[PDB]
Amino acid sequence: MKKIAFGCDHVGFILKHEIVAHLVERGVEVIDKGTWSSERTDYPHYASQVALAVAGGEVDGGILICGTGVGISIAANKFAGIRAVVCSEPYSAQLSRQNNDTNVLAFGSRVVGLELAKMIVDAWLGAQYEGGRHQQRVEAITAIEQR
Amino acid sequence: MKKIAFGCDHVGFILKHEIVAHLVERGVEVIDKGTWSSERTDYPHYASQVALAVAGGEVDGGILICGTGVGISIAANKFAGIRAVVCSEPYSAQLSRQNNDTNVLAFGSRVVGLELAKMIVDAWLGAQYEGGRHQQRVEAITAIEQ
């Protein structure tokens, strides 16, 4: 995860500058997909921008923030080749990389505070997909897509 | 949410008996898609069973349990007509009903303890979808499905 496409709605935006700064500090190139203010806007559009960038290989992964991260991650997961984890603790983030090869992480600005959110990001970026027995399971997910 | 399709893998199974018993205590009729023991099994199959039930209108919603809930909910979200929330607290569950009309709830037997899980289930079951400005956003999720 060297370059990441970032997206958020107006509610997720409250964490944007700090999370972007944290990613730059961790040495990742952030491709910013918006939004750019607290002006009311629709989360599915930003989900699409990040998801398209990840699925099309222009970026290694995506990070998405809304009020809870849930709606924005449901939208992302609708795209083929996207496996998005939403969570409020770092164990789920870490294991989803290890077992599910997640390429998109989401969380909620009204659920997690900033420093917990930073720890979830670190746990996600720090984990490696373990393949092995988990591969046939991940392949089952793809099969669901292409039916 | 009067009829719920339930599914889990062998790790999610550690919460099955008490979560199913709790749904029944709250007057929910549970359609059990398995699994039925702690023998190793693959979570995508139980995701499909629940998703196909919800999508085909056989039940009102779905509940899924694995180690974290994430892989099983990612699988479920790949099905047309499913909006699945995974979480480890009740706020996300509740708001996902209110704003996103979620029809599947997932959580992790290795992430949340039993009584917190019951509270998440209660919040999800008790919340109403509010429609309004949210329907446009939900319609956009469906548009991605095509």
Side-chain angles (χ1 to χ4, degrees), chain A residues 42 77-79 82 145, chain B residues 77-78 82 136-137 145:
Chain A
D42 287 347
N77 271 141
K78 296 303 185 183
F79 290 85
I82 299 304
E145 298 183 331
Chain B
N77 277 134
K78 296 304 185 177
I82 303 302
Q136 161 199 260
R137 289 151 176 173
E145 291 171 348

Side-chain angles (χ1 to χ4, degrees), chain A residues 116-137:
Chain A
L116 182 48
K118 293 190 183 158
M119 175 180 261
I120 295 162
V121 176
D122 291 345
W124 193 68
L125 295 172
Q128 187 151 337
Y129 178 47
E130 298 188 338
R133 74 164 172 282
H134 315 293
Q135 185 57 24
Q136 287 193 235
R137 283 159 196 178

Side-chain angles (χ1 to χ4, degrees), chain A residues 9-10 40-45 47-48 67-68 70-89 91-93 95-96 99-100 102 110-111 133-134 136-138 140-141 144-145 147, chain B residues 9-10 40-44 47-48 52 67-68 70-89 91-93 95-96 99-100 102 110-111 133-134 136-138 140-142 144-145:
Chain A
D9 74 353
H10 55 290
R40 197 201 240 174
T41 187
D42 287 347
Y43 65 85
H45 173 77
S48 306
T68 65
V70 170
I72 206 172
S73 64
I74 291 168
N77 271 141
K78 296 303 185 183
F79 290 85
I82 299 304
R83 291 170 306 285
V85 49
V86 57
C87 63
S88 63
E89 39 63 43
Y91 180 73
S92 293
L95 196 70
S96 88
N99 293 13
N100 316 122
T102 52
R110 294 313 182 177
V111 183
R133 74 164 172 282
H134 315 293
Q136 287 193 235
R137 283 159 196 178
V138 172
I141 295 189
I144 294 170
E145 298 183 331
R147 84 191 187 105
Chain B
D9 73 357
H10 59 288
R40 190 179 293 173
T41 187
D42 280 21
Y43 68 80
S48 314
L52 290 170
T68 65
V70 171
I72 213 175
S73 74
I74 292 175
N77 277 134
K78 296 304 185 177
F79 287 85
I82 303 302
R83 292 172 301 283
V85 45
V86 62
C87 65
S88 60
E89 35 69 39
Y91 181 74
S92 288
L95 202 65
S96 78
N99 294 5
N100 316 109
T102 52
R110 297 308 186 191
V111 177
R133 76 176 167 284
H134 308 301
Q136 161 199 260
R137 289 151 176 173
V138 177
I141 297 173
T142 301
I144 304 165
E145 291 171 348

Side-chain angles (χ1 to χ4, degrees), chain A residues 18-128:
Chain A
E18 283 275 6
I19 293 297
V20 174
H22 179 75
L23 291 165
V24 176
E25 174 179 1
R26 295 308 186 212
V28 346
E29 181 183 358
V30 173
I31 303 306
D32 184 5
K33 303 294 184 181
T35 199
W36 299 268
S37 70
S38 59
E39 187 180 67
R40 197 201 240 174
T41 187
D42 287 347
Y43 65 85
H45 173 77
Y46 303 97
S48 306
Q49 291 291 278
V50 169
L52 287 169
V54 180
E58 41 207 52
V59 116
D60 300 311
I63 288 172
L64 292 171
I65 320 175
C66 73
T68 65
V70 170
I72 206 172
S73 64
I74 291 168
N77 271 141
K78 296 303 185 183
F79 290 85
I82 299 304
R83 291 170 306 285
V85 49
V86 57
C87 63
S88 63
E89 39 63 43
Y91 180 73
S92 293
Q94 175 176 287
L95 196 70
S96 88
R97 290 284 306 122
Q98 292 177 157
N99 293 13
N100 316 122
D101 197 24
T102 52
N103 50 15
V104 174
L105 162 70
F107 46 85
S109 64
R110 294 313 182 177
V111 183
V112 299
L114 172 63
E115 292 296 319
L116 182 48
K118 293 190 183 158
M119 175 180 261
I120 295 162
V121 176
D122 291 345
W124 193 68
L125 295 172
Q128 187 151 337

